[PDB]
Design a protein around this ligand. Structure first.
Ligand SMILES: [Mg+2]
Ligand SMILES: [Mg+2]
Ligand SMILES: [Mg+2]
Ligand SMILES: [Mg+2]
Ligand SMILES: [Mg+2]
Ligand SMILES: [Mg+2]
Ligand SMILES: [Mg+2]
Ligand SMILES: [Mg+2]
Ligand SMILES: [Mg+2]
Ligand SMILES: [Mg+2]
Ligand SMILES: [Mg+2]
Ligand SMILES: [Mg+2]
Length: 231
RNA sequence: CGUCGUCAGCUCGUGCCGUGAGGUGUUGGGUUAAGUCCCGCAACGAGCGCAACCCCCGCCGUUAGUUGCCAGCGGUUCGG
């Protein structure tokens, strides 16, 4: 499912703001820009997707993590396709390490779903309606994707392992495997299954994540053709 | 019971950082009479305080009309 002209969309970036541990995944710096060995990206995807597929057909969740503005929506898109949890907005410390406690906050969201499902007394004061609404709206912003996650994930998918340092550290502290799209400014050794490629351009994120989902959806029953994306 | 002080504060649970005392939260930007509320944040919640629920006063209504009141009509000893 992997394709070959990802060259058409990314082959890496960033001038010498690199992490030396990312050396083995670099071809050269042509424009004064670290360019990624796309053959390495291929070979890695082969190893990585193999892990993904196996995890899919054994029926276990993958928590997709993206928070940078460019990968914001694109992860809500494709993770929804998989029907798998994501965190798009703020990564709340202890989402894994303090799971049960954060999960105490979906119940609130849950209980606000029901209460506002009407009426169960709209005879609650004026000032309260506005409040609890603002609450639900609020809760909705952050726990929208995390609410699907009803128990500790089997692995996580990160768009930027550097940006998402905390998440990488939480999962790792829990022996939960970590798969990641990572460019030259990330730390390879911290990542279990690497996608050495640009993590900034939405194009690359789109290619890698959508095609990642195509692995997920295909392996747990049926398949499907193209998924929503901005040019 | 007094006092600091009606001052806006004092903490806990779990997670995170530290060998450790302990830190974080509770800091930060805005706001309020207020840890008041908003936004942000390795923190996410919870409690005791704050506030509100109570009393008096200020406007109005309903229910009542004496021992209280007297607008209007009668007597009016000349004082509802
Ligand atoms: Mg980057
Ligand atoms: Mg020290
Ligand atoms: Mg320790
Ligand atoms: Mg402490
Ligand atoms: Mg603590
Ligand atoms: Mg304090
Ligand atoms: Mg303190
Ligand atoms: Mg402040
Ligand atoms: Mg005060
Ligand atoms: Mg408060
Ligand atoms: Mg805070
Ligand atoms: Mg009076």
């Amino acid at each position: 499912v992997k394709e070959l002209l990802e060259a058409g969309v990314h082959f890496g970036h960033e001038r010498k703001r690199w992490n030396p541990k990312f050396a083995r995944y670099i071809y050269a710096e042509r424009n004064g820009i670290h360019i990624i060995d796309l053959q390495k990206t291929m070979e890695e995807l082969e190893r990585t997707f193999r892990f993904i597929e196996d995890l899919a057909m054994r029926g276990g969740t993958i928590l997709f993590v993206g928070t940078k503005k460019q990968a914001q929506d694109i992860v809500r898109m494709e993770a929804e396709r998989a029907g798998m949890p994501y965190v798009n907005q703020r990564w709340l410390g202890g989402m894994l390490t303090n799971f049960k406690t954060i999960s105490q906050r979906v119940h609130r969201l849950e209980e606000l779903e029901a209460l506002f499902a009407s009426p169960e007394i709209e005879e609650r004061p004026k000032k309260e309606q506005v409040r609890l609404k603002h609450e639900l709206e609020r809760l909705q912003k952050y726990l929208s994707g995390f609410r699907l996650l009803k128990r500790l994930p089997d692995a996580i998918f990160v768009v930027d392992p550097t940006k998402e340092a905390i998440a990488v550290r939480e999962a790792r502290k829990l022996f939960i495997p970590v798969i990641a799209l990572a460019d030259t400014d990330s730390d390879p050794d911290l990542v279990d299954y690497i996608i050495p490629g640009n993590d900034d351009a939405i194009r690359s994120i789109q290619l890698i994540l959508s095609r990642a989902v195509d692995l997920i959806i295909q392996a747990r029953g049926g398949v499907v053709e193209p998924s929503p994306s901005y040019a």
